[PDB]
Design a binder for this molecule. Structure first.
Ligand SMILES: *[C@@H]1O[C@H](CO[C@@H]2O[C@@H](C)[C@@H](O)[C@@H](O)[C@@H]2O)[C@@H](O[C@@H]2O[C@H](CO)[C@@H](O[C@@H]3O[C@H](CO)[C@@H](O)[C@H](O)[C@@H]3O)[C@H](O)[C@H]2NC(C)=O)[C@H](O)[C@H]1NC(C)=O
Ligand SMILES: CCCC[C@H](N[C@@H](CCc1ccccc1)C(=O)O)C(=O)N[C@@H](Cc1ccc(O)cc1)C(=O)O
Ligand SMILES: *[C@@H]1O[C@H](CO[C@@H]2O[C@@H](C)[C@@H](O)[C@@H](O)[C@@H]2O)[C@@H](O)[C@H](O)[C@H]1NC(C)=O
Ligand SMILES: *[C@@H]1O[C@H](CO)[C@@H](O)[C@H](O)[C@H]1NC(C)=O
Ligand SMILES: [Cl-]
Ligand SMILES: [Mg+2]
Ligand SMILES: [Zn+2]
Length: 611
């Protein structure tokens, strides 16, 4: 570790901890920047040499973390919990958590290599056609197939091809990662890595609180599921759709069946009302990636939040490179921890759902811009779910028919009950369909980290959860050679997921509060906070707090409640919740999937007829 980056000496008291945190911040920003920059160079240009440099940067970060972590525990282990300065407690508490820096050097190198290799496998996996040369990438190729194809056999080829190509090679690496991760965090005092991940929410009742939320939300999902299953039955037939069983997992518009907005055209209750999927208009009008990011930016500035700085436009990767070089296409927003460089890396496609993704990612950037002057350790969301909700909340306003009209994406304006059902159904396909998936992913991973799910049951327990919560089934047979959890980005890239369940609840609490602050006095689902500087100032207070204060208190200040609450989501959706319940009763639907063992047959002449 460079001498200038090494911890000096400080008193064993709070006043020494304060000087300790300032000296830490100085060197931490440099160590973080080199690490983030190395990751950027790799993720925008996947090569063996760039992976080598990223692993070296990661090792330097662990060296820094160990030196300052062990100094913090040498001086302040018994006194940090009683500091008068609450923010200093939070800084010290972070510095003393060593994580992977607890591993001996050889195991640190093994850990870093596993992360690099798992990331490379996921982001370079291809589905090749039997033209053995011609191969499809996840983004854009397979994504577009899952979204736009209505051929059962083609969707099956993409789904199976992807899950086999990405998942199978990941499994042995993921087992080794799990063990090393647990070994590291057990030395921080946690029973397993999942216990450390859950500790970020600082709630002893976290898992019970989540379960109580899901109980309130499940009836909405069950009714949406049944309605969509009926629509799929009308298209695909009784051979491929069981009206009393799970839905085949490749028919819902998305590789993970996690959002169903891409099948809206098949389920739209009132098709002679305005077409709320504006993708065709974006195409017809010549929208490009840069337009989408500028439109998102202008929403933020309309609230008197910050525009994207020049460094963002100069540094960001907003389209998949055409030079063919391999990149991580999965969208992400980057803080370089130097208070200057902030970037998005997105293989942007011109679609309405991608416009939502742009807002999501710009939400992350806006957070970074607002807390850039806090101590580096507090440059975080109040909890990780706050960070995920910011851009989604703005996108709730952007997607309203009234707002789409303002930005020239929807000429026809209507305010009637049928148009409301259409819109709320489209929003339910995006938001309510996700809830079971957002809930289940880390239930699977918590079980893996705790040892309840050993490698011999990775796929068994994955599909148990997928059927239990989402009510879907794999469209081809799977066994424990398959590792279908690994075919979802966040698993090999070791990104926790419960934040997204939290953020899908929170964003409606936020929306309700901002709409009220904006002076809006109509239905919650028609609110548009565009150009509300009052709403912007309330949101700005959250963003500037970072993780300096307990999230329960930040939430109370914003929305008047100190807890996650499903009521605002329920209130947003109430008209379509009622409508879907009535429609399923009239149609005699069975809610749920009592034929839990059912799987669709293979197409005749599959995969042979894929050409
Ligand atoms: C779409 O239309 C709805 C419904 O509009 C209402 O019902 C129609 C059948 C007609 O009779 C309309 O004349 C009638 O307004 C609109 O929602 C409604 O908005 C109004 C105005 O913001 C709300 O009235 C306000 O109520 C608050 C108290 O809640 C008072 O303080 C205000 O002074 C004002 O009277 C009304 O409550 C609201 N209705 C519901 C059920 O929420 C909606 O604004 C409109 N949307 C668009 C984009 O035009
Ligand atoms: C719309 C955003 C899609 C892209 C997003 N990308 C991650 C990168 C996280 C990351 C962390 C550390 C290193 C690298 C990446 C991020 O921005 O959170 C993502 O995955 N969202 C979830 C979940 C989700 C789905 C719909 C939403 O409206 C919001 C969230 C999903 O699509 O499954
Ligand atoms: C796991 O499955 C692999 C792929 O074949 C699968 O099972 C057959 C019966 C078909 O249903 C097919 O659609 C499935 O994808 C096998 O090659 C492999 O041997 C199996 N692994 C073990 C350990 O048995
Ligand atoms: C990709 O990385 C290599 C080093 O592995 C470098 O020589 C090359 O210039 C990079 N390409 C781009 C476009 O940055
Ligand atoms: Cl999280
Ligand atoms: Mg779409
Ligand atoms: Zn995010």
């Amino acid at each position: 570790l460079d001498p200038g980056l090494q911890p000096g000496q400080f008193s064993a008291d709070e006043a020494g901890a304060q000087l300790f945190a300032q000296s830490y911040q100085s060197s931490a920003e440099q160590v973080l920047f080199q690490s983030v920059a190395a990751s950027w160079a790799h993720d925008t240009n996947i090569t063996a040499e760039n992976a080598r440099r990223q692993e070296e940067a990661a090792l330097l970060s662990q060296e820094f973390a160990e030196a300052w972590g062990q100094k913090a525990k040498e001086l302040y282990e018994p006194i940090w919990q009683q500091f008068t300065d609450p923010q200093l407690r939070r800084i010290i508490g972070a510095v003393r958590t060593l994580g992977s820096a607890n591993l001996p050097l050889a195991k640190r190198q093994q850990y870093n290599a596993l992360l690099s290799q798992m990331s490379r496998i996921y982001s370079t996996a291809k589905v090749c056609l039997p033209k053995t040369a011609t191969c499809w990438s996840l983004d854009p190729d397979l994504t577009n197939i899952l979204a736009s194809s209505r051929s059962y056999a083609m969707l099956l080829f993409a789904w199976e091809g992807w899950h086999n190509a990405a998942g199978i090679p990941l499994k042995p690496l993921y087992e080794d990662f799990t063990a090393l991760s647990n070994e590291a965090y057990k030395q921080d005092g946690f029973t397993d890595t999942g216990a450390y991940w859950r500790s970020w929410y600082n709630s002893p009742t976290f898992e019970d609180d989540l379960e109580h939320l899901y109980q309130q939300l499940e009836p909405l999902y069950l009714n949406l599921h049944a309605f969509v299953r009926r629509a799929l039955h009308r298209r695909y037939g009784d051979r491929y759709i069981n009206l009393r069983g799970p839905i085949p997992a490749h028919l819902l518009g998305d590789m993970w069946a996690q959002s169903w907005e891409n099948i809206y055209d098949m389920v739209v209750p009132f098709p002679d009302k305005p077409n709320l999927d504006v993708t065709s208009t974006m195409l017809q009008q010549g929208w490009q990636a840069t337009h989408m990011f500028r439109v998102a930016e202008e929403f933020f500035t309309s609230l008197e939040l910050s525009p994207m700085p020049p460094e963002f436009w100069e540094g960001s990767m907003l389209e998949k490179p055409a030079d063919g070089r391999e990149v991580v296409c999965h969208a992400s927003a980057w803080d370089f921890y130097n208070r200057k460089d902030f970037r998005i890396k997105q293989c942007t496609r011109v679609t309405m759902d991608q416009l939502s993704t742009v807002h999501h990612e710009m939400g992350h950037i806006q957070y970074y811009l607002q807390y850039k002057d806090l101590p580096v350790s507090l440059r975080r969301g109040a909890n990780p779910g706050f960070h995920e909700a910011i851009g989604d909340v703005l996108a709730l306003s952007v997607s309203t028919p009234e707002h789409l009209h303002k930005i020239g994406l929807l000429d026809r304006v209507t305010n009637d009950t049928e148009s409301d059902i259409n819109y709320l159904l489209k929003m339910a396909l995006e938001k309510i369909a996700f809830l079971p998936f957002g809930y289940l992913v880390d239930q699977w991973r918590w079980g893996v980290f705790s040892g309840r799910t050993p490698p011999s049951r990775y796929n068994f327990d994955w599909w148990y959860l997928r059927t239990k919560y989402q009510g879907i089934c794999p469209p081809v047979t799977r066994n424990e050679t398959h590792f279908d959890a690994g075919a979802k980005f966040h698993v090999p890239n070791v990104t926790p997921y419960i934040r997204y369940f939290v953020s899908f609840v929170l964003q409606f609490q936020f929306h309700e509060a901002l709409c009220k602050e904006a002076g809006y006095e109509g239905p919650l689902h028609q609110c548009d906070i565009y150009r509300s500087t009052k709403a912007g100032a309330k949101l700005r207070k959250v963003l500037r707090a970072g993780s300096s204060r307990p999230w329960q208190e930040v939430l109370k200040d914003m929305v008047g409640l100190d807890a996650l609450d499903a009521q605002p989501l329920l209130k947003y959706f109430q008209l379509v919740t009622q409508w879907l319940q009535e429609q399923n009763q009239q149609n005699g639907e069975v809610l749920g999937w009592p034929e839990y063992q059912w799987h669709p047959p293979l197409p005749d002449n599959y995969p042979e007829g894929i050409d």
